[PDB]
């Protein structure tokens, strides 16, 4: 195209500006936590900002890229949802997942999607008159193995696998409380893994079951996005467990 005006140009600081501007926008808010289980991986976002008049059924902030790959996203500002920005990454990733499954008869792994996120951010960098998305995605899924995985990506396009991680509103603070909660029993019992996601989200700001939405994946079976009614019952049971340990 005609637009080739600079938006990204390299720094002597050894960085790309947009990527760093994005990284702080995931520091400042939109808590998304993920834990990896032993049959099931669960990811959760807190905030859809259900003010008790909004719809909860059709709103998606966790989107299924595939039936064995799902991502939960975050990056926030004053323009609070960057759902739009995510929605591009979501649509291109959706076709690519399906596409990989047509060509290669193994079910697409999270490791393929994570390299694909690293190249999309980069490609936008090299092209003239174009800028990296602000998103960070917690890519969840199942391989050829049928092994549950949770991988996390950053706005630069670098990926690591992690058993349990928290990002948003102090990434390290939510993760270090959650670090005690990650035990051998917790990862084994599937039901305990669902609680682990919810239990982390509660540390930043407590209560709300409508604000919290989490999606669950079991084996290579399709994504199931849980009802808010299921969440409310779960936060009530989590709050009593905190009093029991302590």
């Amino acid at each position: 195209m005609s637009y080739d005006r600079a938006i990204t140009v390299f720094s002597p600081d050894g960085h790309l500006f947009q990527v760093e501007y994005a990284q702080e926008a995931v520091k400042k808010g939109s808590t998304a936590v993920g834990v990896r289980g032993r049959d099931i991986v669960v990811l959760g976002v807190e905030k859809k900002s259900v003010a008790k008049l909004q719809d909860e059924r059709t709103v998606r902030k966790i989107c299924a890229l595939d039936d064995n790959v799902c991502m939960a996203f975050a990056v926030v500002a004053s323009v609070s949802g960057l759902t739009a920005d995510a929605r591009i990454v979501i649509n291109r990733a959706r076709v690519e997942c399906q596409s990989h499954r047509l060509t290669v008869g193994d079910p697409v792994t999270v490791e393929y999607i994570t390299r694909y996120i690293a190249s999309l951010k980069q490609r936008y960098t090299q092209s003239n008159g174009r800028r990296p998305f602000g998103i960070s995605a917690l890519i969840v899924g199942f391989d050829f193995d049928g092994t549950p995985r949770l991988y996390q990506t950053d706005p630069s396009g670098t990926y690591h696998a992690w058993k349990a991680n928290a990002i948003g509103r102090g990434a390290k603070s939510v993760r270090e409380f959650l670090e005690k909660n990650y035990t051998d029993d917790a990862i084994e019992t599937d039901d305990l893994t669902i609680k682990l996601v919810i239990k982390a989200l509660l540390e930043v700001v407590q209560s709300g079951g409508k604000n919290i939405e989490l999606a669950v994946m079991r084996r290579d079976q399709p994504l199931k996005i849980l009802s808010p009614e299921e969440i409310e019952k779960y936060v009530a049971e989590i709050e009593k467990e905190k009093e029991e340990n302590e």
Partner: protein
């Protein structure tokens, strides 16, 4: 259902059986050759007929899968090799065709065998073969073949099949290249001549 690269499944291995042949079936252009090529150590395949065509499609199959397997650190399956070959070849069609490769690997749902031909047929069966003269062969073999044959037990099965096959067959200047594939490895049992095995057995 036809020769030139043929495979039949067992639990322990698959049998890989192939011909060394040059040109059409009317004369050879060489005598020394092995047309058997190792694209990956996942298994061996090699054909004949329309020579450029078999080599071309397998070479694409080999490129895609090998890069994906090697970089990702995830082993590619029977299903994946077959899907790459299939997708490529229909597109390329109208630029000669005659690919006859037999795909093997062991998967999460157990051992899987798919037969890849240049029509666009993708088949699992007792024994399948793509190329030409094995079409006759699948008839006698099925009788003497169990669902699960051991490797040693399978080697003896090949030797008898062949030894009668040379008597019936009138194609000369061939070798039977015998390979057993134990999964994501490929080893060569023996590369015995078709003329030798009639005397032995």
């Amino acid at each position: 259902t036809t020769t030139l690269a043929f495979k039949f499944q067992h639990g322990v291995i698959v049998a890989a059986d192939s011909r060394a042949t040059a040109g059409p079936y009317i004369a050879s252009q060489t005598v020394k050759k092995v047309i058997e090529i190792n694209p990956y150590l996942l298994g061996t395949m090699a054909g004949g007929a329309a020579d450029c065509s078999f080599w071309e499609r397998l070479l694409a199959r080999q490129c895609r899968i090998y890069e994906l397997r090697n970089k990702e650190r995830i082993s590619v399956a029977a299903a994946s090799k077959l899907l790459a070959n299939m997708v490529y070849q229909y597109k390329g069609m109208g630029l000669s065709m005659g690919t006859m490769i037999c795909g093997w690997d062991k998967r999460g749902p157990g051992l899987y065998y798919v037969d890849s031909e240049g029509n666009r047929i993708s088949g699992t069966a007792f024994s399948v073969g793509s190329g030409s003269v094995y079409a006759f062969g699948v008839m006698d073999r099925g009788y003497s073949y169990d669902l699960q044959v051991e490797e040693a037990y399978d080697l003896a099965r090949r030797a008898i099949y062949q030894a009668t096959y040379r008597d019936a067959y009138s194609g000369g200047a061939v070798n039977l290249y015998h390979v057993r594939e134990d999964g994501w490895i490929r080893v060569s049992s023996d590369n015995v001549a078709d003329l030798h095995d009639k005397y032995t057995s």
